[PDB]
Amino acid sequence: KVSLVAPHQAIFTNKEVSQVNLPASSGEMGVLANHVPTVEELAPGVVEVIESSGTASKYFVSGGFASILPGSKLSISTVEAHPLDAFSSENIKSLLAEAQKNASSADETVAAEAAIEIEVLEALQAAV
Template sequence: MSAARWYATEASASTSGLRLSFVLPHQTIYKGVEVQQVNIAATSGDMGILASHVPSIEQLRPGVVEVIENANTTKKFFVSGGFAIINPNSSLDINAVEAFPLEDFSPEAIRANLAEAQRTATSGSSEEERNIARVEVEVLESLQSALGSK
């Protein structure tokens, strides 16, 4: 290894777009599909990823992954958490445990589950139960705000 440093080289001209792979343990949503931009909710903050992005690994919050396929098509998924790996060659790998299009969620179920989780978070019988409920409240509040801004 030489001590010289280089700037990250740009992706070759043949791969001008961002290649997205978005996989769940039970399903492949995108497999090396060229897209324009992907917006993710990382634990370090919300970020938009375009081609030739600086390589990075980001932990995903329970939140929305927005895939801008082209100027006309944008798809929004709610993911329960996972990782996004931004590779040096303009490819992006997103791994999540669960991901669903926003229209698959039931606002009534979210409201009911949120009320239940909030109740357990404050008056659950054990500390463990309350901690679990606090995580659920966080997820459901994020889900609710995601649906609200659809």
């Protein structure tokens, strides 16, 4: 029973799942059957949902808030949720190289925005 609904499409929608492992703010938590209530913030990691057997679908979430209801319901509300096969290795190196050179090079919010983009690009490139 998962409710992974994005702001453009629905992934889980209906309750027809078993286990789901999503990266939260603390550690890589994983929901099982009757999960406990835990409303922690989701970080920019991989949100894999195991479908009974080995039919897991790795969905690289951009970060959100993993809400766990008391009736064994998991609501993973994220902004963007794409698979691992929808990313390119050549295009990912261009975004990480431009964010590293722009960091600590100006003022205002230009140097602060480059530090968050370099950390999210390094975690997605290491999980190929």
